Design a protein around this ligand. Structure first.
Ligand SMILES: Nc1ncnc2c1ncn2[C@@H]1O[C@H](COP(=O)(O)OP(=O)(O)O)[C@@H](O)[C@H]1O
Ligand SMILES: Nc1ncnc2c1ncn2[C@@H]1O[C@H](COP(=O)(O)OP(=O)(O)O)[C@@H](O)[C@H]1O
Ligand code: BEF
Ligand code: BEF
Ligand SMILES: [Mg+2]
Ligand SMILES: [Mg+2]
Lengths: 537, 186, 509
């Protein structure tokens, strides 16, 4: 064993052809997939990934495990970039889009060893998908709480899941409250709002859901108030900085007469000081600049008990302002003047307070005019668990933004897989030929999710996998009696149940893209028959 | 003439001919975000909406108490009138050709162009110009003192649809096709 | 490289268990001192748990998670540091068998532990009695409780005093919860020497900065304080301020102007008729002169933290630009301005004969850090009660109560779900045990009796430290903030629940 030599065709690098490379690819994808096949399902578990300094992170987000795990090799990166696509597209389904991909190559490859051209296998998988995508719309349905359910089942393989009921609720709640219309209709749920925060202390359950937003800052000078308004407040969402001006980059102050020295000088302080006044003089009780504040132009807010926060997160102010109806003041101008325009640009908020959280202490803008908004704040044992709590609070809360934007769900629990399996499997004879083996493989291959969903329970999973297999195989006999697919796995107990009833819901939009995608990879790799690796520099 | 623009994400099927043309740039994050204007008139400003840019060793000296705001408040208008003349010539969507020389669209000049509800889009590569003048039917605008309503186009729609974390620009309804390609792996 | 399977699990458990093992002989009234050596140079001779584990770098991930537990816990309550570590370990350890021996999946053991925690927390509030956060005597004999087990006990009473006399001083209710920022308003100040008792809680601040000019007031009776950001010297232009002179007698002109602006500045300050001007920045020699005859003593360079605490015990709100210097920015409510010279090192005081400055004295710069930390624990459990007037049966009593009410329930639950639940109960028992051990008495003996007496005869029955016999808490009393018993069990069960989620460990960024 071991490929080698060259003889003719002098090439500045490595080059494997046929069997040799074609297997290498399959091995590659295989390994990168197998690392995260033990994180699949509720019975699946997280892992710790230590660096060189010794620090680490524990996480089940397949996409971050494959990101965090240094992968060197095309077909390896491919499935790490494909695991990426998911987390970037829908937001959950990563761990699974890879396990599928790997399974398609691994399998398809076997067909080639049997002497079956790659293309004939490719078209075969292509048709198995056409039929499979269509059929996927024959298990799904319109939203008919489906929400607190979607948000829950998406926390099974996660840390946040021991307290499913709690967060499953806080998730939908928080998201919903932020909805908007983008432009011309839409009604999209902010694919990123709800500033999430975390602080070590108290229970996992004691995670608060602010009734507004959580801007993470103090209050400039400790001299100003730490809590303002009980009834109504005017919030100044700025952007321009209130510090001592410096004039044009090319504006030399050339003095010819010692007179002008002192004058123009102290003028500098006032120029950006007037700007301060024209803002306090608007009813501004709360100021949120983005580009920081002077300590001089701060005392002005202090002397006036105006909660004024320095250099804020501009990604928050943009949302702190849509939430108090205010205006992100780029620079007081309008036509040709200068003012933050009394309450014209200001925002209406119920109350601005600086709540503490042991060690930390941040500001809260809870209750507002047009806010609707929310923001969650995790509390855990330490950063190690906390990063992950959120990590999967997101991989969960994302499943919701898509169930919403796309009113359509399918029963997970490895049901979808089983169904497609037996359907495509029987459908496989509708073309016979060599091509049969293709679809057949495709279908058969899908049973990876149900098998591995269960094997992650140690017990002889050949049980469920067999039962669930049979069921659908039967159900599609008058698919008539009382047709009952939607039968998934209940690993916690070890039996086949109706997941739609049980509460195991997953958005169609996931398993529809998770599938169309994973094959798009498998094919571009199925075509690989020679890998020329140039020598670097 | 067949401008193809590939954008990562989706699969191969997600590729369309796109009626009008396909730009390649972002839009506006800064002061007042427009990003979409139905039935608009666009202009390819080869100019640059920034403070006074004298190509010779310029310099603004100061030596007076009051003279402070003189210099300031003055140029504050310099950007303004230019911005008005644009709205004035009925220019809905603005396109600035990337000038590394010395600024394109001053941060300030955006507060104006923000209010004026004029979606601006900068960094239009120089090799585009020629082409954009076709697909957009637009007209290059050397100075502002040549920025006229006829040196514009009949755009029926311009919008930066965020395909999903991607964001691609479009100018629909108006000798140049413009196809956008997608797929999973680069 | 990689370690999947029970392999992983085990090393995690053992790791976590070992973390405990180190400081277990630091939990108890007879607790020993772990003199640790820091890399930077000096040493740490403390027995305060978190202060130890901080000074020990660890490797195994679990040992890292287990170590940070002592921190998040030292952030909620100031106390109960060592306890959380020991519990957090025993929990994982007590699961070890049913985790692999009884092949129970980690999901199930977690589903139970999260459940057993809540029930367990009930039993804590169930045995907790409330307390008069205002009754000076109760607060003292409360603070005193968490001062034992530390070098600072030979002055226990003296400590709770300086504790209360400072918790209450920086406190400020506010309601429209109670806010006690011990941190920014109780700047400590350890001064080598004297006696312990020779330490007081000055109601003001103490800076060692002297006076800007010799012939300047060493102490103004009732001084008029003026606190400011900006420096006291000729400023410059934030633009390209460049002066060109060829007009001969113009050099003198400008060179003079400088003196002139320093004058103006002194005016604006002198205006509100001040006696004490403390600036965070510098003080031009000129400005000193015009503030000398202007009638006031000056203090240059003082930290923001140092300054803003002054502005709470002088009322003197700090102000930047002087041409805006208001008269509301007074220096009212501020006693003397002593400037005692403490062993070849001048100081300055600002007592009034909202923020105090605890000034400790002992017998070395080294011994003082023992006190400071010990004190912090006192001053923190005081704050806890201030914000949660509930207390728990000390002497590990509470810990045993939860052991039974849980043990009982577990035994009466039936299902594989019972074993993990049972362990939480068996686990809890370790604290009265570590106590009885670090006492010297027989663990198997005393516990069986403590546990039994508990099972029926009251729940406020823990173990007595220096004694080693089981005593009733109410009797000689040693209740501790109920808050501590919250965290200790909240995060410990969490920690366990996290690490149990691991079935694989990998190395590389
Ligand atoms: N409650 C459940 N019971 C059985 N299967 C579940 C349940 N919760 C999620 N699933 C299934 O587990 C898989 C998702 O788990 P996970 O490992 O998190 O994949 P991903 O990380 O890709 O979401 C899907 O097959 C989903 O249908
Ligand atoms: N006086 C004492 N007699 C018996 N137990 C005590 C006594 N003092 C502290 N305890 C108990 O020991 C624990 C406190 O010990 P300590 O060494 O202070 O650890 P920590 O750093 O957690 O405070 C608590 O369980 C408390 O109930
Ligand atoms: F870990 Be998966 F993406 F929920
Ligand atoms: F011993 Be502990 F930290 F008070
Ligand atoms: Mg998931
Ligand atoms: Mg203690």
């Amino acid at each position: 064993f071991n490929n080698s030599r060259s003889d003719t065709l002098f090439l500045g690098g490595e080059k494997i052809s046929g069997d040799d490379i074609r297997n290498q690819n399959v091995l590659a994808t295989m390994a990168v997939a197998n690392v995260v096949k033990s994180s699949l399902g509720p019975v699946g578990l997280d892992k710790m990934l230590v660096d060189d300094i010794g620090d680490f992170t524990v996480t089940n987000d397949g996409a971050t495990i494959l990101s965090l795990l240094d992968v060197q090799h095309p077909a390896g990166k491919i499935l790490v970039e494909l695991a990426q696509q998911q987390d970037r597209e829908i937001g959950d389904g990563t761990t699974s889009v890879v396990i599928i991909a790997s399974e398609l190559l691994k399998r398809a490859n076997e067909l080639v060893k049997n002497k079956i051209h790659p293309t004939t296998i490719i078209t075969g998988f292509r048709v198995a998908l056409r039929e499979a995508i269509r059929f996927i719309n024959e298990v799904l349905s319109t939203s008919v709480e489906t929400l607190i359910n979607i948000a829950k089942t998406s926390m099974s393989s996660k840390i946040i899941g021991a307290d499913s009921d709690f967060f499953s609720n806080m998730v939908v709640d928080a998201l919903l409250a932020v909805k908007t219309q983008n432009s011309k209709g839409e009604i999209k749920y902010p694919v990123k709002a709800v500033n999430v925060l975390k602080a070590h202390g108290k229970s996992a359950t004691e995670s608060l859901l602010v009734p507004g937003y959580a801007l993470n800052c103090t209050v400039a000078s400790q001299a100003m108030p730490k809590r303002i308004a009980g009834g109504n407040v005017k919030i100044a969402c700025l952007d321009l900085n209130l510090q001592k001006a410096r004039m044009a980059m090319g504006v030399q102050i050339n003095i010819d007469d010692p007179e002008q020295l002192e004058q123009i000088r102290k003028r500098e302080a006032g120029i950006v000081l007037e700007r301060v006044k024209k803002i306090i003089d608007a009813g501004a009780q709360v100021v949120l600049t983005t580009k920081g504040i002077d300590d001089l132009c701060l005392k002005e807010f202090v002397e006036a008990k105006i909660m004024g926060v320095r250099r804020c997160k501009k990604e928050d102010l943009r949302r702190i302002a849509r939430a108090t109806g205010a205006t992100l003041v780029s620079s007081m101008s309008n036509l040709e003047g200068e003012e933050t325009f009394e309450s014209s640009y200001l925002g209406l908020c119920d109350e601005v307070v600086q709540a503490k959280f042991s060690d930390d202490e941040c500001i809260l803008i809870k209750g507002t005019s047009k806010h609707s908004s929310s923001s969650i704040i995790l509390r855990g044992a330490n950063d190690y668990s906390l990063d992950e709590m959120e990590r999967s609070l997101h991989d969960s809360l994302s499943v919701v933004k898509r169930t919403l934007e796309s009113g359509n769900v399918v029963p997970g629990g490895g049901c979808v897989e089983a169904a497609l399996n037996i359907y495509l499997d029987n459908f496989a004879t509708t073309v016979g030929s060599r091509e049969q083996l293709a679809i057949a493989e495709f279908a058969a291959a899908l049973l990876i999710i149900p098998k591995t969903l269960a094997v992650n329970a140690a017990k002889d999973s050949s049980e469920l996998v067999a039962k669930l297999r049979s069921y659908h195989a039967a159900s599609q006999m008058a698919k008539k009696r009382r047709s009952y697919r939607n039968y998934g796995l209940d690993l916690i107990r070890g039996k086949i149940v109706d997941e739609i009833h049980a509460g195991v819901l997953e958005p169609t939009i996931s398993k529809v893209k998770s599938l169309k995608s994973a094959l798009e990879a498998c094919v571009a790799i199925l075509r690989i028959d020679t890998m020329i690796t140039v020598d670097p520099e | 003439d067949i401008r193809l623009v590939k954008k990562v994400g989706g699969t191969i099927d997600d590729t369309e001919m796109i009626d009008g043309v396909v730009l390649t740039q972002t839009a506006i994050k800064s002061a007042g975000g427009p990003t979409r204007k139905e039935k608009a008139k666009i202009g390819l400003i080869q100019f640059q909406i920034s403070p006074p840019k004298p190509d010779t060793e310029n310099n603004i000296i100061v030596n007076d108490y009051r003279q402070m705001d003189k210099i300031l408040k003055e140029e504050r208008a310099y950007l303004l009138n230019i911005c008005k003349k644009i709205k004035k010539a009925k220019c809905n969507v603005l396109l600035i050709q990337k000038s590394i020389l010395r600024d394109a669209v001053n941060d300030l000049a955006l507060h104006f162009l923000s209010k004026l509800n004029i979606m601006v889009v900068k960094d239009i590569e120089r090799e585009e110009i020629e082409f954009l003048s076709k697909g957009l039917g637009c007209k290059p605008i050397a100075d502002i003192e040549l920025f006229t309503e006829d040196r514009l186009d009949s755009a029926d729609l311009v919008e930066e649809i965020d395909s999903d974390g991607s964001k691609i620009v479009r100018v629909t309804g108006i000798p140049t096709v413009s196809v956008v390609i997608r797929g999973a792996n680069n | 490289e990689r370690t999947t399977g029970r392999q992983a699990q085990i090393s995690n458990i053992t790791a976590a268990k070992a973390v405990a093992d180190v400081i277990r002989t630091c939990l108890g009234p007879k607790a020993m001192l772990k003199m640790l050596l820091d890399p930077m140079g000096g040493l740490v001779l403390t027995n305060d748990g978190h202060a130890i584990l901080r000074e020990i770098d660890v490797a195994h991930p679990a040992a890292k998670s287990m170590l940070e537990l002592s921190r998040t816990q030292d952030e909620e309550v100031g106390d109960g540091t060592t306890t959380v570590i020991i519990l957090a370990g025993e929990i994982l350890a007590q699961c070890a068998p049913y985790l692999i021996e009884k092949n129970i999946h980690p999901v199930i053991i977690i589903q139970a532990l999260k459940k057993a925690l809540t029930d367990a927390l009930e039993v804590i509030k169930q045995v907790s009695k409330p307390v008069d956060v205002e009754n000076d005597a109760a607060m003292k004999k409360l603070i005193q409780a968490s001062i034992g087990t530390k070098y600072v006990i030979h002055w226990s009473e003296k400590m709770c005093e300086l504790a209360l006399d400072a918790v209450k001083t920086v406190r400020k209710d506010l309601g429209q919860n109670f806010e006690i920022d011990i941190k920014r308003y109780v700047r400590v100040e350890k001064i080598p020497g004297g006696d312990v008792l020779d330490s007081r809680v000055l109601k003001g601040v103490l800076l060692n900065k002297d006076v800007v000019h010799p012939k300047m007031s060493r102490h103004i009776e009732n001084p008029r304080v003026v606190l400011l950001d900006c420096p006291l010297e000729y400023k410059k232009g934030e633009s390209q301020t460049n002066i060109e002179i060829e007009k001969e007698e113009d050099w003198n002109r400008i060179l003079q102007i400088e003196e002139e602006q320093v004058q103006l500045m002194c005016e604006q300050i002198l205006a509100v008729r001040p006696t004490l001007v403390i600036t965070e920045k510098g003080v031009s020699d000129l400005a000193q002169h015009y503030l000398l005859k202007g009638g006031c003593s000056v203090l240059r360079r003082v930290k923001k933290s140092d300054n803003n605490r002054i502005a709470r015990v002088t009322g003197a709100t700090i102000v930047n630009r002087v041409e805006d210097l208001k008269e509301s920015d007074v220096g009212t409510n501020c006693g003397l301005f002593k400037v005692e010279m403490i062993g070849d090192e001048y100081f300055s005081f600002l007592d009034n004969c909202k923020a105090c400055t605890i000034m400790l004295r002992g017998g070395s710069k080294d011994i003082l850090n023992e006190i400071d930390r010990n004190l912090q624990d006192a001053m923190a459990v005081a704050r806890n009660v201030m914000l949660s007037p509930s207390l728990s049966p000390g002497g590990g009593a509470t810990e045993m109560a939860v052991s039974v009410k849980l043990a009982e329930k577990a035994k009466q639950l039936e299902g594989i779900q019972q074993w993990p639940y049972q362990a939480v109960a068996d686990a809890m028992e370790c604290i009265p045990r570590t106590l009885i051990q670090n006492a010297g008495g027989d663990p198997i003996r005393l516990l069986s009796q403590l546990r039994a007496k508990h099972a029926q005869g009251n729940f406020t029955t823990g173990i007595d430290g220096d004694k080693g016999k089981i005593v009733d808490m109410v009797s000689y009393g040693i209740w501790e903030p109920e808050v501590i018993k919250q965290q200790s069990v909240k995060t410990a069960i969490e920690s366990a629940c996290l690490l149990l989620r691991v079935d694989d460990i990998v190395s590389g960024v």
